[PDB]
């Protein structure tokens, strides 16, 4: 069985080929101790990764070393490796083919460079890099279809035509699920709402996850927030703060279709689909607007594929076939994708070999 | 004309939109009595605002309605906003637009509460609540920048652009006034003293605004601190105890910068500003950088604006043009800022009507 | 082979490492006689530390030399642990490392005079000073959690994250068993009594450890008192004058919530450890709300442990787990936690010798 490790700018899922669930599935931080020191408990190793780092902050200087899903510290997304081989899977890298993962138009000497670590410091018996949109439309079955990840890093749009990446049109949108609960912890202020802590940073993400959504029409929604309570639901801050959250619930979403709330003037996902298929040939586009798949951790809002299903509409043609699918499991496509792809037979002799690598080297790719 | 309030957690702002400089300025404290006697002349009273809850505090237990930037009780805010009108300001709620102000970014209900109690219980006219740093950026005269209003409960890091913050960098921090005293009040227990009272706490909280400073570098002031008496200031403690405070009246003050000194896990208000405007788009930046601007009560300590100079500086690449403001007028800001914008012509328009929430409801903004 | 010596500001808890129980409890009071006073079967004396002076006081000068967790004397101190050595565990320091305690906001000036004294002058291999609290959290067993440390003159709470408390959340109160001591001195007083002789005067001491209580449900069991039933109980005195205290039993130990009764604005135990896990960070709160621990000389009282269950559970809402933790030990707990930390196997390492002492110097510790 062969190992998949999705690195995510802030959730790195590992497992193997086959599981349907992701095995290892964790915050994909790096911590270091503040003051190391010399016993147990005291912050004694020079790196954690995962849950253990996230409570131990306290102690440490956390560090996210991919951005938008590049990776930009190697000497960190080794050491993370590392943990997520031997602590999470609790298996020897040398053992089990791995197939890692890329965010869209990737710097082709990074992906190098990744093909370069898990054959040398790691020595993995065999590899295969692939990308995000292309693993999570596996998870659909499909081969054509453009899609649109979200995630915590940054939002990519990418035109597969038939098992293949149309460059031209792999759109991105660097406002992201981290952005977006930024965006939330903006706007919770002048309740005197406290999210300024990482602590009081995961609260604000919670809250993106449980109660915000995607308003079918954002000006109609304000005035319902304005005239009930409709909107406002409350929630309990682990201190134990009865607070109640109600515009934010739609505002925080928003973000993706206005970038601008955050202070970016760059096209919406809608906006940005619709773009990248018509920088598509013409008989490309038809396929992609009906089989605009959603990935990612952001596309999981309420309301996010009725609101994308309109509005690609108004965008298209009235009798073009405008069609939203998106899977419950969204977080997690990328990985399944990854699953997916190690255990399918007829993708046996497509891996790279450790000959390859030591006759031909990491350019290859 | 309107009426603007300044509401903290500790001090209470108010007066005619027309002005230079507010009318009612008290501090935010409910009183209630220890024992049934008798006021002379009096009716027993219920509970004591501002002022002579402030004199009467000895019987008396005071609770502030406002922590950390929250309107946190509701009756006890009531109290306060009818302290200003029926006692402070000598007038009727019904005659005057009102203004009142808040914590960089708001959703909803607490707002809706404020709103509400305003047009119900007081009916005034209108009111509009409005930003309390962005605000002294309307008393600075700009629009861009990064603000540092920090108060009693609540510092803030507020970058601008336009009328509004960039807000994905407001940092909070609950690092303020009232845990800035309670350090001077354990090193001076420290130093061999004792403090009961909380009227005993305001002659610490006093010693504070007359006696603590902040040094330009911390290690020379030790050193100076370790070489003369020279830093030593006396004072008449009320009943008589001419105390001596030597190195204690920076080592408070310094909190901001380093939180280590109460022993907390927050790195320090000079590095915060770095990190905010990290987090903002990179080039408006330099604008920020160039205003930064500071607002409230902890902020009035002498020294702080070119420290800040120093130590940002060194956080920042130094090509960076940084830029601190820190008004002569600071506690006051918020409110000069409040009464121009609500004595202003194109703003008129923009005030919430009584009508308004009649037909619409409290979430009107 | 090492030793533990823990200084409170009425007993000294000093023993080997290792041992379950202290080896040498002796009270921290120096004593100077009044007069070249030849007691008949000895020659002159100096100075007379714990039992001797205590048995001798009459002929005394009594003063205690940590008074509320700090040392304000040194002199008395250094001939207390010279007595702790040679007289009470009757060793030769040189070769015995030894182990001692500090207050909870202990100076680094403290610390380093005790570091001072045990080399210098007792010439001991290896000493350590621990943080008094901290260690009851060592003697409960974990690294996290809010310790409620109430001795015979200090109350405290202190919350650890991982072996590092955090000062800020660090409260203090100086009412305790001695402040409560004398409270119950006089509630008898009017009770009917007079503790007019000296052994009164102590055995007041005695009837608070022996029939105290924090009773659950204070004012209903007012009622109890009002309806005097069988809660009735005498006692005999140190000569036979059956003594019937009742009421005052519990109503004494009811000072620990409310300040009031003894003329304290200050707030109550429970509250402070409210405070303090408020002053905290936001997702650590859980820990501290989970594990938190009282020990020390006012804990002993029955129903203490029952009492912050409902006190916090009362004040801090309703999604956590609170969890008081009151051990059996408690009343030596600051002292079996150094003593099996100083005999622990990975412990060695932070054995601070005299290479380090003398090289480093005080600074060292």
């Known amino acids: 069985a062969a190992l998949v490790i999705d ?5 790195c899922k590992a497992g193997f080929a086959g599981d349907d ?25 020079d790196s954690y990764v995962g849950d253990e780092a996230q409570s131990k902050r306290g102690i440490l200087t956390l560090r996210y070393p991919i951005e938008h899903g ?56 065999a590899f295969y890099v692939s990308i995000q949109a292309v693993l999570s439309l596996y998870s659909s079955g499909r081969t054509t279809g453009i899609v649109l990840d979200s995630g915590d890093g940054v939002t990519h749009v990418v035109p597969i035509y038939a098992g293949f990446s149309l460059p031209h049109a792999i759109l991105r949108i660097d406002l992201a699920g981290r952005d977006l609960t930024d965006y939330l912890m903006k706007i919770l202020s002048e309740r005197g709402y406290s999210f300024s802590t990482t602590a009081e940073r995961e609260i604000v993400r919670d809250i993106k996850e449980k109660l915000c959504y995607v308003a079918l029409d954002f000006e109609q929604e304000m005035q319902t927030a304005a005239q009930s ?11 134990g703060q009865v607070i109640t959250i109600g515009n934010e619930r ?34 490309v586009r038809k396929e992609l607007y009906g089989n605009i798949v959603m990935s990612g951790g952001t596309t999981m809002f309420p309301g996010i594929a009725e609101r994308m299903q309109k509005e690609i509409t108004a965008l298209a043609p009235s009798s073009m076939k405008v069609k939203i699918i998106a899977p419950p499991e969204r977080k997690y496509s990328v990985w399944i994708g990854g699953s997916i792809l190690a255990s399918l037979t007829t993708f046996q002799q497509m891996w ?6 030591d006759e031909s080297g990491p350019s290859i790719v």
């Open 7 to 11: 690195n995510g700018s802030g959730m």
């Open 70 to 125: 590049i990776v930009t510290n190697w000497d960190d997304m080794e050491k993370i490796w590392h943990h997520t081989f031997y602590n999470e899977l609790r298996v020897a890298p040398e053992e089990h083919p791995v197939l890692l993962t890329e965010a869209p138009m990737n710097p082709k000497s990074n992906r190098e460079k990744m093909t370069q670590i898990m054959f040398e410091t790691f020595n993995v018996p």
């Open 21 to 45: 669930a992701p095995r290892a599935v964790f915050p994909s931080i790096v911590g270091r101790p503040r003051h190391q020191g010399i016993m147990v408990g005291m912050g004694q190793k």
């Open 250 to 283: 739609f505002r925080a979403p928003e973000a993706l279709f206005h970038p601008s709330v955050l202070g970016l003037e760059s096209a919406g996902i809608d906006q940005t689909t619709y773009n990248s298929i018509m920088k598509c040939d013409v008989d």
């Open 229 to 239: 309570s409709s909107i406002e639901k409350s929630y309990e801050l682990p201190d």
């Open 352 to 357: 790279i070999s450790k000959q390859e690598y």
